[PDB]
Amino acid sequence: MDKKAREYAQDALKFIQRSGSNFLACKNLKERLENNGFINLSEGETWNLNKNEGYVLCKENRNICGFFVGKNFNIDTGSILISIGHIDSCALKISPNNNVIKKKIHQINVECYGSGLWHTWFDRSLGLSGQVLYKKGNKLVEKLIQINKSVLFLPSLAIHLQNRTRYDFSVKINYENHIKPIISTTLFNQLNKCKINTDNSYPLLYLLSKELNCKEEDILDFELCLMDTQEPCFTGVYEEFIEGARFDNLLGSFCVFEGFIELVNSIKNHTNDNIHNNLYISIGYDHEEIGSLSEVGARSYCTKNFIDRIISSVFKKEIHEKNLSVQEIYGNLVNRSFILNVDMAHCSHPNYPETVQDNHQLFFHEGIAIKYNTNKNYVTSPLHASLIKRTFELYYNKYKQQIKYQNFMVKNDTPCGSTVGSMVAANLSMPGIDIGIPQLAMHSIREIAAVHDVFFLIKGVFAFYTYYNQVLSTCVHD
Amino acid sequence: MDKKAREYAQDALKFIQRSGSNFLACKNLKERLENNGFINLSEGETWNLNKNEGYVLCKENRNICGFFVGKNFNIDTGSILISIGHIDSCALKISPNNNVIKKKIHQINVECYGSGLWHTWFDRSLGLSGQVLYKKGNKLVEKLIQINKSVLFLPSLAIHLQNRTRYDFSVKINYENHIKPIISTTLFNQLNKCKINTDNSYPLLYLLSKELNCKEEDILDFELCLMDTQEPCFTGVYEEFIEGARFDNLLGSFCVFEGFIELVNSIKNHTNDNIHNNLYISIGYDHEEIGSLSEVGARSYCTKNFIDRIISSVFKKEIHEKNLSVQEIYGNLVNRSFILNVDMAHCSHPNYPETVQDNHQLFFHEGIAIKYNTNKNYVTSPLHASLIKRTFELYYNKYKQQIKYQNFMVKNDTPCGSTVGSMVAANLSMPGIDIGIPQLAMHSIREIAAVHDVFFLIKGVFAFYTYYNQVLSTCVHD
Amino acid sequence: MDKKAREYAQDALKFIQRSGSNFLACKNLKERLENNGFINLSEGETWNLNKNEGYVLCKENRNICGFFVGKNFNIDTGSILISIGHIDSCALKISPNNNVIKKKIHQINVECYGSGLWHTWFDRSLGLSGQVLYKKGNKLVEKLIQINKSVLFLPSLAIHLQNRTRYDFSVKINYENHIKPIISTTLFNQLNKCKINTDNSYPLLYLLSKELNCKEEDILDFELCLMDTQEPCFTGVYEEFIEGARFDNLLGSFCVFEGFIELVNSIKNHTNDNIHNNLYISIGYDHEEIGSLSEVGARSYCTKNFIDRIISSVFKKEIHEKNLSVQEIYGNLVNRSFILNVDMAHCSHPNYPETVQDNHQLFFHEGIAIKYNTNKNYVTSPLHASLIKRTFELYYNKYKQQIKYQNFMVKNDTPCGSTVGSMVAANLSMPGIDIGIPQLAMHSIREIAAVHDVFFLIKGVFAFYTYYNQVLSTCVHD
Ligand SMILES: [Zn+2]
Ligand SMILES: [Zn+2]
Ligand SMILES: [Zn+2]
């Protein structure tokens, strides 16, 4: 696994450093799915879905959703298997009116998107990734940009100005005042000008026009996210960790789609009856960090309408002549359905032993977290994790490679952030689980994670895809 | 100057990224001085100094001190011109007993050297630079190592565990407990072992033995400093800033020695009487961040004994036969002497307008700071800055390139950190000034500075070297 | 070692109980050095120093400094080895105007010298030690007194008067008001009078006149320190500890001079080339507890002028005819020089586990502390402790007795008191180390320490004296 765990983390470290925002997360995953032969269908034309074919759609370039229709569906004995991991992170997005000129320094005022460690974003060689809408002729042209060179810097305050050396000197980052990255000075802005809107920064507008090869006056408005220009890398002495940026479920949703790609490649190659019996959906949501209340979030009707469009297009012919309905067929498959929500989990911090549960601890290379909660912030029920642990045991009987797992639970007094596990499980009425891999410094600009956990997560989504209905057929209720 | 300012910042960005600590600061500057032909003399043999020759000495590989004896000294009309910038920074040095195994994670406990923004050191791909003493046979072998790959990581706490989203969530970095970088896990430490001292970390001892090509049992003890593995780079949209690490007077003492190298090259080439009339010393101190109370610090007798060894070796023949003394000759040259202390200064932060003086502000590309103080934490007197501003005007009359300057003064209510200006001016009884270039986020792991200020500082040390006695001859007291 | 460790602590317990102050510390050490044959030379006559002879000088009876000139000095290959431990402690010194008559009780108002546990000085049978200047005829006669009987008592407040039994009843010792020892009542002062200055206490003036055998009117002024009259003793069940008083480096500077005496006795007896090659200085400083800013402190020019007087008197003949200077010769020997600062260290307190570092702990009988620091309050560098640990290994190869050591480091958040390690290392420009032995209740009136650590310290100073140049010759720098 040492070789396959490093090869899995290598491709994840090719995915991140190209996935600088939520837009290039949808773009690079759609490019990753189209390399295996997925038919890229748009939401706006018409859906004529076929058996045995895989499909992919970016809903308005924020929400990736790739699904694979099995060969023999059975309305009677079949399932809809969904793996979920949001494609976004806590980033400093750029405000619309950004022209801050203070102390002879051109600045951007950025909006803090999500709930992040914003003091870690201080003193970083920052870049740009996101979506820029610009004019070309009479047509609005949309381009996803990726500026991997350092063009922004959020400077900290020098230590000499406040009181020093005690209780970490009472550092307080005011989110409006102190979080405003510098981009240029007014000296070299005017020096690089002689060789229309006053709301956009001309150092910024010169930068995007250099990337898009147009005038700065053609740049209309943009949704840009600040990213750290430092490439992700294997760390530790033994090159045993991974870290670069955005590992809050951009590493995790890589394993959602890498586990989904290996499933479809296992279905298409070497062609055993129940693998062609399911609808395997793999959706990368947006706007998780702010609560999923969006048109492309988890609380959206987007996924629920996607399944009701797959059911209507696949079973187009059997609605008419045996008088079934969509909600009859959808509620028929919901009993055999499942949701595998993948989002990162808190590894046991060695420097903070007071924020960890005693029994439910997570360590690196120890396996997938299975995140439980008091208040169902994670949707894991002890029945529905027992089915997934038996999919990990059916993986061990066939591939002779153990998928390790470990139960994670936050302390009863401390609160924890909710995920999209129970959001989609309420929208789709499907049972669910919340798994993920342990990482340290979650919601920060650099997040460290283990490379064996990337192997266990990719095989963990693949084992849930392959062996869920083999476990579900053996469950007898009263 | 645009071309020469970028070329000066380019070589500074070659100096830093090789100067990872205070030891490789002495090593790379001694290599930089020996490329121009400086005679590397050791403290332990004998000093036979000559006219017209330049010398360089690392005092126990921490304190660099390069000096140039002019061709015609005059005890009557001659000077000792000293430029000073310490070669060290706030870094996380490694403790001697470093074997921290908590939560199945191998850690280093590091000692916070200096007064730094230690919350900025969190979540950085950290490396190693410093001095390692190891055995080879029966001989203690000393080697200066530089590990530019990321082998350490100081992780932050995840945001979900404390209270969130208000007043920056009451972040408090306990300096002992929370500052302990992780280096490995106990899984891959034991996994990479089967394929003597219990105080040193075996993940660390495996790492240094891999660099030194010896056994881990030969590594005795080391003075290692954690550095950030990210290379320094030109930033801004117009590539107009510089930042990587350690810019608290490792950029500034580069300009001390780059201004010193250009002086000696101006003396040796194109061979006008008073340029050969002085002793130009350029010393890079250690241990400034902790108060210079050391054997290689500014409060040491090292510099005072160096001048009394230069005076004794140059004027070896005139002591005997006209019955002069060292203190007679040293106090004769102290009246014409000067100290140019170079250390970085606080640029006007746009996000913190309450910590800046109204009239004494520093902006980027606006010139050298001339740091004044109430309590003489900076040694600048208004007489002795008036001589240096006239050396900047004599530079403009010859080279037709203006050396811009700006006066810097901290507010009366806020305290500021003292420098080595008044420390060496008391030890040597020489008048002084405190100049430097404005930078933001001083004493942090990433410090941003302007590239025109690097040009003004290098020409500023060069103008003080070339034109001080031309200004000093025109001063008439009562 | 059990026999030699008890014999070493026995002579230390003869030294303390005669060393009641800083004056009798200089006196008894000068008597201890003169018993081995050290030539007692005064500062005021002339220095005609010889090879192979040992010298001793009390600078104005506060600062002891004994040195031994080796037989064959080599300016080329030779060294100055200095061991340092201050001879003073936190004591209640007597104020000049001491006539406090309150509530019919004669009192002394004492000045709190140093930073001590002054609540431990309450309720002690206190004595007197120090220097008394008195007249005899027309001549000012100076006498060092030692009153080992209890003549003073600093009483506490009874428990019934404040609130009781909770959180240690809010004890607050006001340093002026509550620290005033009673000495007599006005009843027995007047009763013992019938059988000039109003500023001195007549109960005190009767006491010193009884010791000096003169009138009370001849006593002019005095520098007296209150001491505890209880003799030091071996404690524990197994007689395994030592405690009496003043063990903050009066026990430690005993090991400085006992390690120095055993060196000189090893040089004179059994007469191998490099032992006669060095200048072994052993200096006992004063005024450490208040910051060494004194004429006899560590920040004084006393030690720096002593070495420049030894170099001038030993090399009196080679200055003239090969035209060397003092600062040339002094800076030649500084490269091979070292400073061994000895001051006590904090043993791991069992009742206070929150004030100790986790990895850098000190236990009794576990070895010498090697005190490291963040801010170089201790002058120990990891290079220069690596040389001293190899002097401890060269001791083990010759004497077959292991000198145990243990690294000590205070926590990063807590501050620690600075020592004279970096003070003398700045004044002399010599590299240094801070060693010492672990003790509990430092700066208190009773301080407990271990008897094996007294053996390790005496052999530790002796191993640094004997084997430093054997280690220093094997170091190869780049
Ligand atoms: Zn997430
Ligand atoms: Zn500095
Ligand atoms: Zn002490």
Beta strand C39-40 with B448-450 is unpaired
Task: Say if CB A456 and CB A403 are below 8 A apart.
Answer: yes
In angstroms, rounded to a whole number, what is the distance separating the alpha carbons of residues C322 and A475? 102
Sorted by sequence, the CB contacts under 8 Å of residue C473 that are 6+ apart come out as C274
Compute the distance from residue A117 Cα to the ligand 2 centre, in Å: 28
Task: Say if CB A157 and CB B441 are below 8 A apart.
Answer: yes
**Interface partners of C (3+ CB pairs, < 8 Å)?**
B
Compute the distance from residue B355 Cα to the ligand 2 centre, in Å: 19
**CATH 3.40.630.10, chain A: domain bounds:** 1-89+231-478
Q: What residues in B contact A120, CB-CB < 8 Å? A: 122-123, 156
Q: Which residues of C4-43 are buried (b: 16+ CB within 10 A; e: fewer)?
A: ebbebbeebbebbbbbbbbbbbbbbbbebbeebebeebee
Pick out the residues of the known binding site of C. 86, 248, 288-289, 343
Q: Give burial (CB, 10 Å; 0-12/13-18/19+) of C232.
A: buried
> Is the minimum CB–CB distance between B233 and chain A shorter than 8 Å?
yes
Sorted by sequence, the CB contacts under 8 Å of residue B16 that are 6+ apart come out as B232, B244, B245, B246, B247, B250, B251, B254
What is residue C8's DSSP assignment?
H
In angstroms, rounded to a whole number, what is the distance separating the alpha carbons of residues A365 and A344? 14
Angle among Cα B330, B334, B338 to the nearest 5 degrees reads 135
Enter the tokens of residue B327: 């203190």
Please name which of A222, A162, A242 lies closest in space to residue A452, comparing C-alpha atoms. A242
What is residue A278's DSSP assignment?
E
In angstroms, rounded to a whole number, what is the distance separating the alpha carbons of residues B326 and B319? 8
Task: Say if CB B252 and CB B85 are below 8 A apart.
Answer: yes
Beta-carbon-side half-sphere exposure of residue A469 (alpha carbons within 13 Å)? 25
Beta strand C368-372 with C405-409 is parallel
In angstroms, rounded to a whole number, what is the distance separating the alpha carbons of residues C464 and C393? 11
Does residue C59 sit in helix, strand or coil?
Answer: strand
Instruction: State the helix-helix crossing angle for A451-472 and A384-399, rounded to 10 degrees.
Output: 100
Closest CB to A120 among B123, B165, B441: B123
Contact C431 B199 (CB under 8 A): no
For domain B90-230, is the CATH number 2.30.250.10?
yes
> Is the minimum CB–CB distance between A125 and chain B shorter than 8 Å?
yes
Contact B43 C428 (CB under 8 A): no
Point out the ligand nearest to the CA of residue B159.
Answer: 1
Task: Express the helix, strand and coil content of chain A in percent, nearest 5 each.
Answer: 30, 25, 45
Contact C332 B44 (CB under 8 A): yes
Please name which of B295, B252, B271 lies closest in space to residue B457, comparing C-alpha atoms. B252
E strand map for C256-342: 278-284, 338-342
Task: Say if CB B368 and CB B403 are below 8 A apart.
Answer: yes
E strand map for C375-471: 405-409, 432-436, 438-440, 448-450
Residue A93 burial (CB count, 10 A): 18
Task: Say if CB C233 and CB C244 are below 8 A apart.
Answer: yes
> Is the minimum CB–CB distance between C160 and chain B shorter than 8 Å?
no
Instruction: State the helix-helix crossing angle for B2-15 and B451-472, rounded to 10 degrees.
Output: 100
Task: Say if CB B52 and CB B71 are below 8 A apart.
Answer: yes
In angstroms, rounded to a whole number, what is the distance separating the alpha carbons of residues B167 and B158? 16
Which technique? cryo-EM
In angstroms, rounded to a whole number, what is the distance separating the alpha carbons of residues B245 and C142? 61
CATH of domain B1-89+231-478: 3.40.630.10
Q: What would the DSSP string read from start to end of C336-378?
A: T-EEEEE--EE---TT-TTSS-SSS---TTS-EEEEE-SSSSS
What is residue C95's DSSP assignment?
P
Task: Name the phi and psi angles at C460, rounded to 5.
Answer: -75, -40
Task: Say if CB C89 and CB C114 are below 8 A apart.
Answer: yes
E strand map for C245-292: 278-284
Q: What would the DSSP string read from start to end of A194-227?
A: ----SSS-HHHHHHHHHHHTS-GGGEEEEEEEEE
> Is the minimum CB–CB distance between B59 and chain A shorter than 8 Å?
no
> Annotation-wise, does A88 bind a ligand?
no
What is the rounded radius of gyration, in angstroms, for the C-alpha atoms of chain A? 24
Q: Resolution of the coordinates in A? A: 3.2
In angstroms, rounded to a whole number, what is the distance separating the alpha carbons of residues C444 and A433? 62
What is the rounded radius of gyration, in angstroms, for the C-alpha atoms of chain B? 24
In angstroms, rounded to a whole number, what is the distance separating the alpha carbons of residues A392 and A403? 6
Instruction: Give the type of residue at A210.
Output: K
Closest chain B CA to residue A190: B238
Please name which of A284, A346, A361 lies closest in space to residue A82, comparing C-alpha atoms. A284
Q: Which of left, alpha, beta for B426 (phi over 0: left; psi -120 to 50: alpha)?
A: alpha
**CATH 2.30.250.10, chain C: domain bounds:** 90-230
In angstroms, rounded to a whole number, what is the distance separating the alpha carbons of residues A266 and C474? 65
What is residue C189's DSSP assignment?
H
Closest chain C CA to residue B60: C335
Enter the tokens of residue C185: 């009542």
What is residue A273's DSSP assignment?
-
Angle among Cα A347, A348, A352 to the nearest 5 degrees reads 125
Enter the tokens of residue B279: 């002793």
In angstroms, rounded to a whole number, what is the distance separating the alpha carbons of residues A295 and B306? 73
> Is the minimum CB–CB distance between B192 and chain C shorter than 8 Å?
no
- C185's enclosing H/E stretch is strand C182-185
- C466's enclosing H/E stretch is helix C451-472
Sorted by sequence, the CB contacts under 8 Å of residue B325 that are 6+ apart come out as B319
What is residue A414's DSSP assignment?
S
Closest CB to C328 among B141, B176, B312: B312
In angstroms, rounded to a whole number, what is the distance separating the alpha carbons of residues B24 and C426? 22
Enter the tokens of residue C73: 């000095």
Q: What would the DSSP string read from start to end of A304-335?
A: HHHHHHHHHHHTHHHHHHH---HHHHHHHHST
Sorted by sequence, the CB contacts under 8 Å of residue C246 that are 6+ apart come out as C16, C19, C20, C89, C91, C227, C447
Point out the ligand nearest to the CA of residue C345.
Answer: 3
What is residue A232's DSSP assignment?
P
Enter the tokens of residue B292: 């210079």
Q: What residues in C contact B301, CB-CB < 8 Å? A: 304, 334, 426-429
Q: What residues in C contact B91, CB-CB < 8 Å? A: none
What is the rounded radius of gyration, in angstroms, for the C-alpha atoms of chain C? 24
> Annotation-wise, does A217 bind a ligand?
no
Strand partners, C142: C133
Q: Which residues of C391-413 are buried (b: 16+ CB within 10 A; e: fewer)?
A: bbebbeeeeeeebebbbbbbbbb
Closest chain B CA to residue C332: B44
Beta strand A79-84 with A338-342 is parallel
Q: What residues in C contact B140, CB-CB < 8 Å? A: 386-387, 390, 471, 474-476
Beta-carbon-side half-sphere exposure of residue C115 (alpha carbons within 13 Å)? 7
Task: Name the phi and psi angles at B84, rounded to 5.
Answer: -130, 125
In angstroms, rounded to a whole number, what is the distance separating the alpha carbons of residues C24 and C18? 7
Residues that place a CB less than 5 A from ion ligand 2: B 248-249, 343
Compute the distance from residue A407 Cα to the ligand 2 centre, in Å: 49
Please name which of A388, A390, A360 lies closest in space to residue A374, comparing C-alpha atoms. A360
Q: What would the DSSP string read from start to end of A176-201?
A: TTT---EEEEHHHHHHTT----SSS-
Q: How far is CA A294 from CA A63, A246, B388, C164, C442, in A?
A: 11, 20, 63, 64, 65
Please name which of C421, C416, C455, C457 lies closest in space to residue C437, comparing C-alpha atoms. C457
Q: Give burial (CB, 10 Å; 0-12/13-18/19+) of C44.
A: exposed
Residues of A (350-379) whose Cβ lies below 8 Å from B: 350-353, 355-356, 361, 363-366
Q: How far is CA B188 from CA B52, B192, B194, B230, in A?
A: 59, 6, 10, 25
C340 vs chain B: nearest CA distance in angstroms? Answer: 13
Please name which of A338, A337, A341 lies closest in space to residue A371, comparing C-alpha atoms. A341
SS (H, E, C) A343-376: CCEECCCCCCCCCCCCCCCCCCCCCEEEEECCCC
In angstroms, rounded to a whole number, what is the distance separating the alpha carbons of residues B349 and C434? 41
In angstroms, rounded to a whole number, what is the distance separating the alpha carbons of residues B282 and A315? 84
Q: Which residues of C159-178 are buried (b: 16+ CB within 10 A; e: fewer)?
A: eeeeeeeeeeeeeebeeeeb
Residue A54 burial (CB count, 10 A): 24
Does residue A131 sit in helix, strand or coil?
Answer: strand
CB pairs under 8 A between A and B: 283
Contact C382 B138 (CB under 8 A): no
Mutate to test the interface with A, among B108, B151, B180, B237 (most CBs of A within 10 A): B237
SS (H, E, C) chain B: CHHHHHHHHHHHHHHCCCCCCCHHHHHHHHHHHHCCCCEECCCCCCCCCCCCCEEEEEECCCEEEEEEECCCCCCCCCEEEEEECCCCCCEEEECCCCCEEECCEEECCEEEECCCCCCCCCCCEEEEEEEEEEEECCEEEEEEEEEEEEEEECCCCCCCCCCCCCHHHHCCCCCCCCCCCEEEEHHHHHHCCCCCCCCCCHHHHHHHHHHHCCCHHHEEEEEEEEEECCCCEEECCCCCEEECCCCCCCCHHHHHHHHHHHHHHHHHCCCCCCCCCEEEEEEECCCHHHCCCCCCCCCCCHHHHHHHHHHHHHCHHHHHHHCCCHHHHHHHHCCCCEEEEECCEECCCCCCCCCCCCCCCCCCCCCEEEEECCCCCCCCCCCHHHHHHHHHHHHHHHHCCCCCEEEEECCCCCCCCCCCHHHHHHHHCCCEEEEECEEECCCCCCCEEEHHHHHHHHHHHHHHHHHHHHHHCCCCCC
Terminal Cα distance for chain A, rounded: 41
Task: Say if CB A412 and CB A374 are below 8 A apart.
Answer: yes
